[PDB]
DNA sequence: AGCCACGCCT
DNA sequence: AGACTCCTC
DNA sequence: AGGCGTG
DNA sequence: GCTGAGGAGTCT
């Protein structure tokens, strides 16, 4: 008798976002009228109110409309949404653009041969902006085309842009909490979840804690009109980027920063400056931040390197927002004024700013090293002694490195990945066992070794409502020093642990809390229990400990650059850990620092190549 | 940000 | 025939 | 070839 | 430049 998934997802949506008076705040009377009316519409005139929703925003023909699930025939359904004023249909129909979109081409060439001043046969495009140039001269002519466009097409509807500005301003407040943070992802429609939320999220169980705010984000109304404007623009640069019409997609974002601009001085602003760094991110300034990163990349490819250098310099001058990103940008600096500006002078100065700010981290940080190692180390540069500057030498310690073969078809053995194929040789070479992971491996040990400092009370404003997966500092400097005492002291207790304790706490957050959807473990990422077990008896404690250290003193710059594959063998106990290299992929900076740190952690690490054959 | 095929420089 | 757009799960 | 960078 | 896989229907 449950819903069909579409609804129970949006359903969800509403109900979490809602029950929340702050939120509420952030809607008017005329808004939240309109979400009564919802929840006033019959079961079907819901699912398929949701169906058009989740569709694109523009006219369609009644006969292009099948939903048995829904109804049998859609006419009453149909009016009841045209009554609540969620759908309007074909008789408010009056801009002419509109009426021509909505038909085919084999439709536009029927009305480009009964009108005689047109020429039959192009494409669709083509017949457009003829019919629209054609009414924009002899208006009278033009309104009896408009009338036959109209009549041909047939019956009509469009969802009310009206409420429909409501419902997706509850998507994005909803994306703040789960979506849109764990990374950006799908969304149709004009405002929209992940396909994983809105295919589960009816089924989802989440991990238990305790919602707990005490700040507001957004000021009011229009804060959060303003903060969805520039969200959509984003979106907008984004979308042109990955279809790669770069030139658009630089207009739109001299255009951003232009508003960008305008936009400092408001009183608003000095609230966002206030907040923590985890819930800054979810601010206008925040935003239009993150466009000028993307405006960046746009100057780049247009090969614009004199204005990116200065778009970067802009960016880093200030602390206040993205300073996460900060690792990012500076090395990108040094890449553009070394390489392609060719400025050495200015190349030091950058490289030993980079490495004077707490900011960069992890790859980013030994990445600027390098570039300073590569530089001091030349002799176009030898005119100086200046990267002799207290360099902290941070020469990293070297790795087996190990060559197999495999022949190329994709490989083969049966169809196989370059990562199967390694683990084929490890299997060959004494460890019976082995997963492909990634950060998933490592990720959801933390997960289940620390679950309950991760959901744990105490932390104001971190779950702000019933559908989180992590608490919303995670991410951030303030996750560890908000949680000292209790990590660090899990962190000694780990690190001692028997490794009977190991399985123990293992079993007794599996046990309690399987299934939970949680951002940092993966349900399947091992195929029982009994498996996670038997990795922590080999890992032990020490590597298990320093592991996690990392993953919760600063998960934005350590949740990369892990091993694909851990290896073990059942009796002798000993594991390898193994990052993959096929004939094109190479060692990042982050990898490096990490092999680096799980070997002072004491454990078999091996970079294996895969060469084709 | 990571993946990947490819290319420019040396 | 192949690119493109929209939709479902 | 090997190192470093782009799209 | 790619980022979901798969499919049906439309455009050039
Ligand atoms: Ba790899």
């Not at 509403?14 to 952030?26: A, F, G, H, Q, S």
């Not at 109110?49 to 009644?62: E, P, T």
């Not at 957004?218 to 804060?223: A, C, L, M, Y």
Request: with cysteine.
């Amino acid at each position: 008798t449950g819903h069909p998934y579409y609804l129970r997802s949006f359903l969800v949506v509403l109900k979490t976002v809602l029950e929340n008076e702050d939120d509420m705040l952030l809607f008017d009377e005329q808004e939240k009228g309109i979400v009564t009316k919802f929840y006033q519409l019959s079961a079907t005139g819901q699912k398929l109110y949701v169906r058009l929703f989740q569709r694109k925003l523009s006219w369609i023909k009644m006969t292009k409309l099948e939903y048995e699930e829904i109804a049998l025939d859609l006419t009453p359904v149909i009016e009841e949404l045209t009554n609540a004023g969620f759908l309007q249909t074909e008789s408010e129909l009056q801009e002419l653009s509109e009426v021509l979109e909505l038909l085919s081409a084999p439709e536009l060439k029927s009305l480009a041969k009964t009108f005689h001043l047109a020429n039959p046969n192009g494409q669709k495009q083509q017949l457009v902006d003829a019919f629209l140039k054609l009414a924009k001269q002899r208006s009278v002519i033009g309104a009896v085309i408009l009338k036959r466009a109209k009549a041909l097409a047939g019956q009509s509807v469009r969802i009310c842009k009206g409420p429909r500005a409501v419902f997706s301003r509850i998507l994005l407040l909803f994306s703040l909490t789960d979506s849109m943070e764990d990374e950006d992802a799908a969304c149709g429609g004009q405002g929209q979840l992940s396909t994983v939320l809105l295919v589960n999220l009816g089924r989802m169980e989440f991990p238990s804690y305790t919602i707990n705010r005490k700040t507001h984000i957004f000021q009011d109304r229009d804060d959060l009109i303003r903060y969805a404007a520039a969200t959509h623009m984003l979106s907008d640069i984004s979308s042109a980027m990955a279809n790669g019409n770069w030139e658009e997609a630089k207009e739109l974002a001299q255009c951003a920063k232009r508003d960008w601009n305008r936009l400092k001085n408001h009183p608003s602003l000095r609230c966002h400056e206030d907040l923590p760094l985890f819930l800054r991110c979810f601010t206008v300034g925040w935003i239009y931040t993150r466009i000028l990163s993307r405006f960046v990349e746009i100057l780049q490819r247009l090969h614009m390197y004199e204005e990116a250098v200065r778009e970067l310099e802009s960016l880093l001058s200030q602390r206040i927002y993205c300073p996460d990103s900060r690792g990012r940008w500076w090395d990108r600096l040094a890449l553009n004024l070394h390489q392609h500006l060719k400025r050495l002078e200015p190349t030091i100065k950058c490289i030993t700013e980079g490495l004077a700010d707490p900011e960069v981290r992890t790859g980013h940080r030994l990445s600027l090293y390098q570039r300073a190692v590569r530089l001091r180390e030349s002799p176009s540069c030898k005119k100086f002694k200046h990267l002799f500057q207290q360099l902290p030498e941070m020469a990293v310690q070297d790795v087996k490195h190990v060559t197999i073969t495999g022949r190329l078809c994709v490989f083969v053995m049966v169809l196989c990945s370059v990562e199967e194929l390694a683990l084929a040789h490890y299997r060959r070479s004494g460890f019976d066992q082995g997963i492909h992971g990634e950060g998933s491996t490592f990720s959801t040990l933390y997960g289940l070794l620390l679950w309950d400092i991760i959901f744990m009370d105490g932390i104001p404003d971190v779950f702000r409502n019933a559908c989180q997966a992590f608490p919303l500092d995670l991410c951030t400097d303030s996750f560890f020093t908000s949680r000292r005492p209790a990590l660090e002291a899990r962190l000694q207790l780990i690190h001692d642990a028997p490794e009977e304790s190991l399985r123990a706490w293992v079993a007794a957050t599996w046990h309690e809390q399987e299934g939970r959807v949680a951002s940092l473990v993966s349900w399947d990422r091992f195929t029982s229990l009994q498996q996670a077990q038997d990795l922590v008896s080999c890992l032990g404690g020490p590597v298990l400990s320093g592991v996690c250290r990392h993953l919760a003193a600063d998960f934005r710059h350590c949740r990369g650059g892990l091993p694909d594959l851990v290896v073990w063998n059942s009796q002798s106990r000993h594991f390898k850990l193994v990052e993959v290299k096929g004939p094109n992929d190479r060692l990042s900076h982050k990898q490096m620092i990490w092999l680096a740190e799980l070997q002072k952690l004491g454990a078999e690490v091996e970079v294996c190549h895969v060469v084709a054959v």
